[PDB]
Design a binder for this molecule. Structure first.
Ligand code: NA
Ligand code: NA
Lengths: 5, 427, 9
């Protein structure tokens, strides 16, 4: 669920 | 004297075979290129002076013309990628690298600046400066027992150039280059000057904006604790680059994210999530969403630091973009959280603000909200209290919102909307 | 952000 730039 | 010279007069003097006349014309050019507005960079380039300026860089006997041409070329390279390219096309990169070893510190500093402008143009000019071997001489300039023995301006320029050697992606800086500069960048991140500290944090933020292997090289250096201390700083110019680097590290593994949490990061979010700068609230909320996508002990850390009421606040009132990040944080929390944590969220007052954000035009924010609503309803099923959650959603008017979402343009919106309406709002 | 390139004076 981790969203990066 | 050398103020308000015509490019024609500057070209006449440089084309003399009189080193002193060339120095006068090179200084007149620097003044034109150093004026407050409209530096005639294009006019200087078309006159064909860049080659003469780069040749002047090599005049060890005339250090004045070395400094004058350095400044002129610096300011040319400060412009568009075209003008920087003209400087690099003149063979300036190797000449500036050579000047880095000058005994005149203002000439060295000017070379540092020029290389910063070149490398800051993009990933290709950045790697070309590196290939010419600028890291060794640049890091040699900072090889002192105490950086406080270095001029404030000198230090600031070297840090800003190093930040440009760590900036830009596609590709990211060569791994070897990052490993060769990381040690000196950590020392500048512990410096006391606000500008050196912000540029160092911006360099660290550039290094952490990539794969988890990049994040690891920086985290292995042990900068997270100082980054959390700089996250507490009173200077937004330092707090901005600090939060970005922390957010970048919490985009990585749950161990890298737990390194941030162990360093005390969560204790600063009460202020970052209420920070008057909208950009700070948004980035803090996006760091919180990436933290609530982590392990359950990590979600429990969020909860222990009192950050759930702050997410509720942001979801209640904040810039739409911040609210979109907060809805993401809520959907991550509820996807990965325990039933006890999910119920703590509804006790903190997440239902009303979440259901009120369902009236948003953005379709993705509605899908994210509906996702969390379903996850909380699933936790409600585990407790046999779904009816009370249905009563809570109907009282805040959100039931009406979902009912209308059943006619939304997107299929997933009305699909999930109808599911909950025919799953927890049906007989 | 906006400091990629710097002009002196
Ligand atoms: Na709890
Ligand atoms: Na409940």
């Amino acid at each position: 669920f981790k969203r990066r730039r | 004297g050398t103020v308000n010279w015509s490019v024609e007069d500057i070209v006449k003097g440089i084309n003399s075979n009189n080193l002193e006349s060339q120095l006068q014309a090179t200084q007149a050019a620097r003044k034109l290129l150093s004026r407050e507005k409209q530096p005639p960079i294009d006019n200087i380039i078309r006159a064909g002076l860049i080659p003469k300026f780069v040749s002047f860089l090599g005049k060890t006997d005339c250090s004045p013309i070395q400094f004058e041409s350095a400044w002129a070329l610096t300011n040319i390279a400060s412009g568009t990628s075209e003008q920087t390219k003209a400087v690099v096309d003149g063979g300036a990169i190797p000449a500036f690298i050579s000047l880095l070893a000058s005994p005149h510190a203002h000439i060295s500093e000017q070379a540092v600046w020029a290389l910063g402008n070149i490398a800051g143009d993009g990933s290709a000019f950045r790697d070309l400066v590196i290939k010419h071997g600028a890291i060794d001489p640049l890091l040699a300039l900072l090889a002192v027992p105490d950086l406080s023995t270095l001029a404030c301006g000198y230090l600031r320029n070297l840090t800003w150039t190093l930040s440009n050697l760590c900036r830009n992606k596609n590709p990211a800086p060569p791994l070897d280059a990052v490993e060769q500069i990381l040690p000196t960048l950590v020392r500048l991140l512990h410096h006391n000057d606000p500008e050196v500290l912000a540029d160092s944090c911006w360099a660290i933020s550039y290094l952490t904006d990539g794969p988890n292997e990049r994040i690891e090289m920086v985290v292995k250096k042990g900068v997270v604790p100082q980054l959390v201390k700089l996250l507490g700083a009173t200077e937004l110019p330092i707090v901005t680059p600090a939060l970005r680097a922390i957010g970048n590290i919490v985009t990585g593994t749950d161990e890298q994210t737990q390194k941030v949490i162990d360093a005390g990061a969560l204790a600063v979010f009460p202020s970052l999530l209420t920070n008057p700068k909208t950009n700070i609230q948004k980035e803090a909320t996006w760091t919180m969403s990436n933290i609530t996508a982590g392990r359950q002990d990590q979600i429990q850390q969020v909860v222990n630091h009192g950050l759930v009421p702050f997410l509720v606040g942001v979801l209640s009132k904040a810039d739409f973009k911040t609210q979109k990040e907060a809805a993401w944080a809520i959907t991550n929390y509820t996807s990965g959280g325990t039933v006890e944590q999910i119920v703590y969220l509804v006790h903190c007052g997440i239902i009303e603000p979440l259901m009120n954000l369902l009236s948003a035009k953005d379709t993705k924010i509605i899908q994210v909200i509906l996702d969390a609503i379903s996850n909380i309803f699933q936790a409600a099923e585990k407790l046999g209290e779904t009816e009370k959650l249905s009563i809570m959603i109907e009282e805040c008017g959100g039931l009406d919102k979902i009912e209308a979402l059943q006619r939304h343009e997107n299929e997933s919106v009305y699909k999930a909307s109808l599911n909950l309406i025919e799953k927890y709002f049906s007989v």
